[PDB]
Symmetry: D2
Subunit: 344 residues, 4 copies
């Protein structure tokens, strides 16, 4: 015996078309996705000076809270639309080296069953509702298969720090319909993210699944709307001198020198109250010059901090988020600052 | 939807390949026991040295089979000291443009003919196992393994994907032992982490033998280990080995590890592989109980070329030639004969 | 060029699992399907002397109407449950040589568009509701692929006169979880139906599709609960003499000699009123002896007759049916007659 | 949903390689494509009366041994070339006789003739044989029994049959509507011709039927319709090959506004299931061609290397299904038909 020795089971997976038939994209959702992708493209290439704000929970573990959060964020989206382009974080799984909760797609029931068919349906339904209420959505694509279930509803995608250097993730990015952000590496390596944009911009052949759930060869056209995200290393890398050094390197590689700064993760050193400090520093850069900044990322929820079990409503069970109060503060700060950049 | 997709193309499922090239009794037996033998090495139940040795990449099956036929003689000759398993990597991952590997580009001309490539890959691997040479490879994605993992005795996850969750989940379901390299700037924690993760059950999305998407529930891979392949500085010496083994034991994982003689440890100079090997040989005489394997980039002919003009010469990373391989292998054999006595 | 020369398009087909996931079979529907299949088997093999009545529209073109019909039929199902085993006709298409409306699965919108995905979803939705309210369902399986979408909701199946002689339909029958009736051929050939019962009782290997929509080899175990249906020919064949001759031939092939009589189609000469005459003759055979009769088939709707376009609620757009009044009478007539046959045990 | 209702009477569902796996190993060649393409057009011409050659669908009742088949084709090929101005000879390459009785289920189903079922091997063997035949210059004809097997080798078929037992089946008519080759519908097993006339009707229109893609996934196939369909007279209770039956069939066909050019099966019910009588039928057809017989566009003959039949595949090139005429009788029968038709063609 040499085949599937360490496989316990192979289970039935509904193909993407099953979900697309139940939850077809609406006219409005298409329009919103389409133009949000264009609008972000314009930010990536320096054609517009608004600040892309990718903001929301670290992960989504409860769609009801996600929709209530979206309702609130939507008012600030409209209010700040001339200064900020606000797009909600709708991430289904925090990649984790240890055991623990495996994300909404994997474990929608939050009990260690794996009900991926239900997860993908829930994921798509939440995304469709969000787009339907005027809130565009962003997410991190972890594998090569899940995107076929809801990428059509995504206006901006991330490739995480742990996969920016992975070739098949760069290939995936090269065929994604949405702009894509590549994070610097977990120890602060920027070059891998710069290379990724290089790779992602060219055509690739990668193996994936058709909408019908059958393996196929996908020939991509390249993604011209990729960029770097500074999310910290051994040290934080959000300040002006890091930004400026990043911008030089980007120009040096012939790619866009407009980048995004993540206020969270290793830039806050995992202390959610520091996100505001980073946003303050970014505010200060925009007021002085900050021409290379095109966006920021913030981990924000209804209620602040985090919990191991999903006991409190609207409170993260992955990374600790700022609460809604602080969120209003932060967005007002960034709006006020960028208005003054856009006048200059 | 699919705005940046040029084309979606027909892909034969693994069963089409498995139907034309079914694994043989002899190939199954060889894979089965080479896996056991390597498992014994990983867990410190046998003190032979695993040697993953062969071309950086396979671009010409004829040369590969030739190389194997010479490598087989040495495998048999050193069977008490070394467990020799040929490197049969089909692609070297590259940030920039260039040849994309045998699976992607079997014709070496920039056409993609993945169906032909997967067939060639499986046929080469089956022939190699049939003649008595087991095979090792790097699994880059979650689909290609279904086409030939049954013919593979040891697997690598590359430096670039050791931190990737889905690659760890893949390793958790791989029938073969798996080596995780430290990161391209020398980070070892990510490989230790990767071993921990890979030893547990996971649910990942992939494709059945029949080419249909499915949820695969894995049992966990107990036969994982790390590979020291250098970082900003090389990490092959006795001090690095010792500090690595302390870290591995601290994490509750096997402290038996493999050392790559090429790539960052040689400073990307193929000549230096022998210096690393010498250093490893010297550790084996003094103590070196934490070393279970070495990795060597080797071919019929030394160095490298941009186009496949010269027979048996790598077109990816530069390799030592057949000579320097007879030397490196003797050198490792001699040194480990001593280990296994004392 | 040699491939797909005369093919206009190949279109996306959701696999059975997609429908099974949205409309899983309920506990109650399962129990009812299970039990009804058993109860029918007992009739096929002469363990119970109730009369199976397959009754309802010639074809379903309107689920609302079908449900309302079921609600009324249900009361009579219960009322006569000791004499009659009443199962509703839920046929989606009447196969036709000519052009016209192609059934609910093919043309659920009744406008000449094709929307088979919607059709299959509607068909299963209706079948699940019917079973849930207590009404078991029967249908004609026309191809090898549609049964995966809803066979689990079907308590009795028919293979039509046009396909009884088809080997692939016999093979299909040999793997269907429900009893199956085979009709004599459109000119009155009975041998093909007897042959079909023989064939369907054995194991076969045919090619079909898994629940997941992938082609596969199905090894079937054989269907022991098949029987013939007398549906007329060049002449009608519902009378005692035809029944008696049909039973002789059945015993002679070593298959069950309990058969079903279709009161409609070529036994009524397509003139729906005459169904009552056939039932009357069936009642009269039951009173005398009628040991070989285990079921009847009747084409019945809320409103009698037929129409070309679906303008009048609850009226067939395929073969003309008797309306509700006559349905009550036909059922009372059959119940009364069969009560007397069961008493003579 | 605790009570069981699903796959109660299924023993097993097994793996089936999709058409593309066979098409990859055995792609159609330029020569085979050319031959299929033109043989179909040539047959279309006969169906629509633009050419007065006679289509001759001739060969074993069923193929149980590809080596014998190839040897048979080599022999038939010399007569195909020799009579090419009078006859259009196409080989019968039928894999499986439909049977009510248990017994051998054909080469696709049971390629090892031992009651195993190795349909993957069977389909590979069927395709290989059909490709070998087209590559040597012998076009091939077959009967399509199910909706799935055609995807494996219809690209190598120049003419298709719908059998007597399925001519009335709606799905088979829909299948015919999307088949790339001309198609003949047989009359029913008791002699009903109207079903075959209806079938031509139906097959000529567009349909939607459910089948499998080349990749093995179920799909909806929207067909264009098949304009190259015709009827086959194969007898009933009584034989139906003579001039009066022919003439009565032609009036019915015209009356239905379909082609009044038909094919006559010399075997099966027209021969009373007696292989020797095939020559009788051909003799009668020859007599019709000399008189007038304008409505006849083809004939069907069950022919093999060796005459008769056997239950076990003991003797080489001898049928295990319906009894066939041997090779001697075949040369006779074809010379007979050639000579007769040469005279018809000269009168116009
Ligand atoms: N559907 C994705 C691209 C993509 C990812 N994986 C695929 C597999 C097949 C086809 C397309 C894809 C998009 O439009 O962004
Ligand atoms: N077949 C692989 C395990 C595996 C990798 N990818 C898969 C996808 C599906 C099923 C199994 C797998 C092995 O034996 O090592
Ligand atoms: N599901 C059907 C049997 C069946 C029909 N077609 C199939 C194809 C595959 C497997 C089973 C089937 C039943 O239970 O009656
Ligand atoms: N391929 C067949 C037609 C056909 C049969 N079944 C199909 C399913 C899908 C597409 C085409 C088909 C031909 O060319 O004659
Ligand atoms: Mn986070
Ligand atoms: Mn290398
Ligand atoms: Mn009817
Ligand atoms: Mn025959």
């Amino acid at each position: 015996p040499t085949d599937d020795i360490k496989i316990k089971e192979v289970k039935e997976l509904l193909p993407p078309i099953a979900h697309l038939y139940e939850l077809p994209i609406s006219k409005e959702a298409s329009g919103l996705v389409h133009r949000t992708r264009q609008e972000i493209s314009d930010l990536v290439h320096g054609r517009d000076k608004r600040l892309l704000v990718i903001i929301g929970p670290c992960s989504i573990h409860d769609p009801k809270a996600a929709l209530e959060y979206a309702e609130r964020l939507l008012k600030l989206r409209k209010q700040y639309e001339n200064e900020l382009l606000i797009v909600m974080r709708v991430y289904f799984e925090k990649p984790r080296t240890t055991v623990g909760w495996k994300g909404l797609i994997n474990d929608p029931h939050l009990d260690g069953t794996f009900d991926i068919n239900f997860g993908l349906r829930q994921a798509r339904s939440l995304l469709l509702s969000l787009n339907n209420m005027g809130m565009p959505a962003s997410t991190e694509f972890l594998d090569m298969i899940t995107p076929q279930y809801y990428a059509d509803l995504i206006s901006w995608g991330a490739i995480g720090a742990r996969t920016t250097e992975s070739q098949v993730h760069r290939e995936l990015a090269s065929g994604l319909s949405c702009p894509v952000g590549f994070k610097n590496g977990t120890d602060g390596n920027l070059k891998i993210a710069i290379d990724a944009i290089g790779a992602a911009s060219h055509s690739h052949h990668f193996l994936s699944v058709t909408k019908a759930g059958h393996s196929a060869i996908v020939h991509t056209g390249g993604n011209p709307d990729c960029h770097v995200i500074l999310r910290g290393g051994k040290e934080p890398n959000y300040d002006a001198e890091h930004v400026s050094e990043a911008a030089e390197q980007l120009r040096a590689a012939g790619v866009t020198d407009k980048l995004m700064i993540d206020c969270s993760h290793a830039n806050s050193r995992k202390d959610y109250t520091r996100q505001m400090e980073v946003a303050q520093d970014i505010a200060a850069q925009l007021e002085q010059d900050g021409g290379n900044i095109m966006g920021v990322m913030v981990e924000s929820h209804l209620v602040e901090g985090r919990q191991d079990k999903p006991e409190v409503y609207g409170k993260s069970i992955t990374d600790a988020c700022i609460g809604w109060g602080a969120t209003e503060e932060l967005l007002a700060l960034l709006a006020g600052a960028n208005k003054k950049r856009m006048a200059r």
